[PDB]
Amino acid sequence: MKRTWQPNRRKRAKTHGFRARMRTPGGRKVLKRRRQKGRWRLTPAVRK
Amino acid sequence: AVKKFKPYTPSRRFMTVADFSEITKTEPEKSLVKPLKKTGGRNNQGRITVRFRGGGHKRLYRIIDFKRWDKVGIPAKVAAIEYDPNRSARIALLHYVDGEKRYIIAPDGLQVGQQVVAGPDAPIQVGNALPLRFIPVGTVVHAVELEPKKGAKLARAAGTSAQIQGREGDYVILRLPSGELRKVHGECYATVGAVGNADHKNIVLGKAGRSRWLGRRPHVRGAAMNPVDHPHGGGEGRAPRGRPPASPWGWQTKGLKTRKRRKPSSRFIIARRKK
RNA sequence: CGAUGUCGGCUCGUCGCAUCCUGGGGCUGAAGAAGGUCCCAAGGGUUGGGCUGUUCGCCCAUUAAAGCGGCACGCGAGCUG
RNA sequence: GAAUGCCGGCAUGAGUAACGAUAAAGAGGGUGAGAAUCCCUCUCGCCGUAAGCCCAAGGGUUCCUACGCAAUGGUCGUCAGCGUAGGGUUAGGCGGGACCUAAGGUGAAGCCGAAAGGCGUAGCCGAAGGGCAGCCGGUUAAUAUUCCGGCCCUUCCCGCAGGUGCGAUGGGGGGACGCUCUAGGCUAGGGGGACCGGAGCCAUGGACGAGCCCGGCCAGAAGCGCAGGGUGGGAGGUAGGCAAAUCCGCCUCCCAACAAGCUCUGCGUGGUGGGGAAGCCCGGGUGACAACCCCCCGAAGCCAGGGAGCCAAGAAAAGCCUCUAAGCACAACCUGCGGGAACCCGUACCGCAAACCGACACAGGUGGGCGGGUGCAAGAGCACUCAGGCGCGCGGGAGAACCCUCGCCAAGGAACUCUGCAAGUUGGCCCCGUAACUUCGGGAGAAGGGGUGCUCCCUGGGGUGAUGAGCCCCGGGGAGCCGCAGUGAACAGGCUCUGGCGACUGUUUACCAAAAACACAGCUCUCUGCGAACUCGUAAGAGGAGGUAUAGGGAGCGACGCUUGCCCGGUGCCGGAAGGUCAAGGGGAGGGGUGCAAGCCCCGAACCGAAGCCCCGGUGAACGGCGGCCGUAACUAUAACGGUCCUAAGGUAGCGAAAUUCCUUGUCGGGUAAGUUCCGACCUGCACGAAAAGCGUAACGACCGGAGCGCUGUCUCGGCGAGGGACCCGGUGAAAUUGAACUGGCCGUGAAGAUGCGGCCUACCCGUGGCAGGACGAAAAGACCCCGUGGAGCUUUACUGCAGCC
RNA sequence: GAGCUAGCCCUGGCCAGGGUGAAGCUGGGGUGAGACCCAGUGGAGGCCCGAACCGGUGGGGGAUGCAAACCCCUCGGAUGA
RNA sequence: UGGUUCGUGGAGCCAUGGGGGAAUCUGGGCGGACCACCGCCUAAGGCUAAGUACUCCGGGUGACCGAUAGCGCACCAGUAC
RNA sequence: GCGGGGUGGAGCAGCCUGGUAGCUCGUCGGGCUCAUAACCCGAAGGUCGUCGGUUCAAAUCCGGCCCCCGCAACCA
RNA sequence: CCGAGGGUAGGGCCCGUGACUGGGGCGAAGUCGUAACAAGGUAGCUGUACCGGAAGGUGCGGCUGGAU
RNA sequence: UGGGAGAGGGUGGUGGAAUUCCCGGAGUAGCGGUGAAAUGCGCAGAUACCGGGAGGAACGCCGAUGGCGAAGGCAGCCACCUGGUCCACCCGUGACGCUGAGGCGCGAAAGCGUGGGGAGCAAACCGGAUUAGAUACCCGGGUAGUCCACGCCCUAAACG
């Protein structure tokens, strides 16, 4: 059938993007958190 | 009148449409149409705050002149009678002698080509706008301002009118479309006569789709729901109400008066409504 | 109860005998024929239909007869549902 | 040593199941250590409204070559979307940006919120919408509307000339619009040609033929031609389009008006530039100086902002045109030349898929365009077939049971079974012909029957041509021929009768229910006078609604027809300036504490003191409810009538063994040989009943009952045949399960159903194909049941709160 | 977290081909005038048949599957909610 | 209403959302309802080191671990997946 | 299995709270009427379902038996 | 070719008949009431609607075949 | 040709009396109704009286035994549009006439559909009395309806 994942580069960048994150206090915390754990990517990779 | 259809399909059996007899111009005035923002019934929170709305025909909003005391003593001609999707009533297009073109809600008996005017000086003749105090007691009237210069709020629906019962001080006594008896201020403007298309109410939509065309999505009965959704929800098989008939939000919906008793306008309402 | 799938049907049988029929008998209110009733006997046989999910049962047409029961109300790692 | 423990390792099941669509293969010749599987050729088969081709998502080097074969590839592998290396993506014109707006997002001003934050006009962001300048060919192993060739165009800057009151984020026009139907003329595309060009060809009985086979175009500025789109012209006044205005708007006047003119598109031609087949010579060379013409079919595409009818009434903003304002008129703009200048990003490759989403090279999912020809009435259906692509990455054998998919069956013809489930029958088109009932539409494709090919002859009307020939679309009449059969193949309704329920088309439990459920037009009740009611939010702010009682919210009922009775005592709701209670507060008779006191402090009765409740009323398409026991008729039976008890009032009409009837397969009738079902009746209705609507209703229904005709492998009752598996051989090789096992039958015994204990009987060791009776077989820490002072969802006149309202 | 799914908003797009033949319009009859009947024209509809597309009725297969919802045969809608 | 041990308690004290609303030392707060005596103190402006907390970092030392232990990571780990 | 009931001839009070059986109708007697119903005046009839117990005393309170109408019978 | 007729398929009219059901007509002395005929004890009759055990009642309009 | 009488018909306006209801005064112990009463309304201030508002229906006196119409039927007043009729003058035409199966139109009241209106009245209905009963007659309420528009129905003791 149609499955749950329908890759769309615009959707990705706008939902989980760095600019998306930084706006919302919760988003900034995701960044803070991911930075503290030392993730190599703070945010999903997407080709813009 | 009201045009009927031969029952060549099941819904066509009862469906009735407007005659559009009075309509003289079939596209609107470009300078007077703005786009209509369709809500879906959703507010700025994105939330549905009015149930069962959406999916209707696209519309443009004809800007209507509800003030009229803009152009006092400046006459206007009835250029055409047009279709407006945004109201029960029809709209009349006026070319003023000013050159300025505006829309008004078209009264009954209004004929294309006649000349209308607004002001204290105005003749008491259909389509003219005067402040209420200068209109003879006992004459039918529509498009009535509620407060001075604040806009026409009363009797804008097809076939409606308010009648002038009498006077008292700076206020006059009106009988509104509902049959309520109201004190409306003397300087409040009003157009003489009643709104046209009085055969509106006699229309039979005919089928579900007709309603859907009007942006009216299906209305589902509480009784058909579950206790999570409605007071009338639940029960094995069909069920009576089982409580005082109620809204989804729990207030009583048979006879429970809701208007705020301490409202300032209470001083001005002589008699509650009719039937 | 860290699971023994539960009516009825279908298929496949097998066992018991308190015998429905066929075989052998005694008594009869057994003339003959046809029955009644009891004894012996489980080798074989024991129909096709209408109605109901039905088991059962009633009815139709026959039949030598249209037996009653056990097998986890025999049988769903055989099917049906 | 045990925790269905945790981690890891290795076993068992087992050389077992499987190796992913049943579109299909065979051979020859290369390569090489090795070949069913890589390369080449011939033969055969499969897709062709695709399984072919372009495009957008998404993927991210998978692309092209060279060299490899450890792993990946469901086998092999020399091959590869694999490993290593090298190479490959070229734009002012194609897409996006340096343009414009849409929902939405953000947001100077402004608003609100404990903080974080929420909202918000202008503005700004935001596109697959508007605007905008490139078409054809050649070329690389791999890029091309990008490089190259030919023809063509856009913007910016500067300069020259002519021209003008020039000048804008301001004004105004335009941009600018629906659904259905559709005209004219073209083009895309197609078919045919006795015409033009073409290597060849004569076979096996015939044909040197008006024979075969093949091809017969593409792009193209200016000008011209055809077809369409758009647009009135001139004065006078003008108070309106937030300043101005010669622009637009309004009024008056002259003139003219499906013309013309003006301008804008499309098609045609067009200097020119290209392209060019079959066949056989090793992608190329040749054909070839290729020919490049005529006729017909003809778009859903073009002219396009065309036309008409309808109601549900069908974006914005910029580019562009025009008006003026500061300003400025050595400027500025308009026009035509000319030189110069023109940036960033994408461009490979997959793209219905082995490269995207599905853990897989996964029978699944994925938007747009093109999609040839013949025939079948049409068509994107169906069969074949072109271009093109493929034979689905294990094979070779055998011809058991059994399973799947399929074909046929004597006599019967539903006897099968819960049920004609399933499978037959029917099947397209044309012609005749069609009932109850009906809301006059329908029911109707009712039913039922006839025709259907091919040959010859005669003839009738239309399109294109020309009014003809030719081509092409509709027909009609007569005479014949063949076969078992002519919609000879593929595609393509079984019908009728009668009930229940829902009017109807719709909708629903993604992934066990598609229904009788939800919805629905329609009916009634009720709220709401607009800063509406109601909804969301602490608020601001929204929705409602740029609406205004012919409107908006809530509730029930659910087309339509005839109807919808009686109860207001309890509950709700509505009304009631009285009375009864009533909280803070007010009032302070009167007491109390301490003090030498002036004083400070505390309790405190009357009396005045809202809503709410009490109380008086109204209210059923408000919550709801709508009797009992006795008797009584000139036969029996029954009770129109009577008695009495209770009630707020005792079920009306219409229906009734019902989607409701327990007793129950009620009784009678119908249908049947036979009818617990069905239909029709009766009525002591366990326990119908009137908008949680009652009784009917044409039409409709993949809903659920009953019956009949048709026809059948459903059955009596089974038989044979087909292929794909099962089976044998080579290749690869899982799984759950598993305390260990050296794992028989009976009669017993045992925790009450023993391979494992007792007695007996039976039995050489070991496999393979099969069947499922047992291992209380597997699976899932029973979903039933109880237990737990375990949990959650839901309810209420349970308790206590809370928002909200008073 | 609304890249699945449900509703709404904005902007685009798709629906072969047949069949039925409403209103209207014209003509003819009609009548004082009408209503109205007839024929032609016309092309309406949650109209009919049926591909694409959207579904998912009945059965069978599949059930350590090709697939954690698939396949085959059939069947529903297909200008419209 | 909050804070304190203080849950309305005999409920002061400190703080304050609402209503009322003074005085300047003969003023004012407090010493657990309140009164009087006896005292303590000087509100409604602000600042102020050290002693105290913690360990990303550097070092020192362990009757701490010794590759399933010890940090999740002794190794290209917040990685692959 | 749980509940209400049994009383002049009929239908109902009285029981709860022991001592006192009542209301409407019917039956009978006398009136009015030509006569009958209606109507008017008076009258009779229960010994409280039976059996036992409590009591000074039982329709009444308690316990059996018989009857008579109700309500229930669910998870499988 | 036609063709008696046979067959299949659907229509039309008449007849008989049917669980049951609707009223009708008659039937020496049945049960209930008393609507009408005297102002019939509410004048009657009426078309129509609604209601009630039944005659009947009531509403709306009409007639006198009614008022004495 | 000229003249007359008339509730003949249709459309639109407009007038006052009366009933009800609502508001404001003033005022108090009952009002209403019957054969007599009860239900009912009224100290929550009714009836009776004065003032003001709204709304619907019907038109008092004139009014008659009268007038008009084919019948049904038609009654305040005003205007418009319109039918039939009688009289007189003897002018026009020249039997053009009478009747009328079908058809067609009209057709009280009730009733019906869709929408308005709803003061009074009032089937159904509820209550109070009468009564053996009283699904009636009388009383207090009361819904359709009565009223307007349009379309149906087409009956009558539509009678002289």
Ligand SMILES: [K+]
């Ligand atoms: K259960």
Ligand SMILES: [Mg+2]
């Ligand atoms: Mg699906």
Ligand SMILES: [Mg+2]
């Ligand atoms: Mg899909």
Ligand SMILES: [Mg+2]
């Ligand atoms: Mg994207």
Ligand SMILES: [Mg+2]
């Ligand atoms: Mg997106």
Ligand SMILES: [Mg+2]
């Ligand atoms: Mg973002």
Ligand SMILES: [Mg+2]
């Ligand atoms: Mg890094």
Ligand SMILES: [Mg+2]
């Ligand atoms: Mg992130």
Ligand SMILES: [Mg+2]
């Ligand atoms: Mg209609």
Ligand SMILES: [Mg+2]
């Ligand atoms: Mg109109």
Ligand SMILES: [Mg+2]
């Ligand atoms: Mg605009």
Ligand SMILES: [Mg+2]
């Ligand atoms: Mg927002």
Ligand SMILES: [Mg+2]
């Ligand atoms: Mg949000």
Ligand SMILES: [Mg+2]
């Ligand atoms: Mg709402």
Ligand SMILES: [Mg+2]
């Ligand atoms: Mg909504």
Ligand SMILES: [Mg+2]
């Ligand atoms: Mg309108």
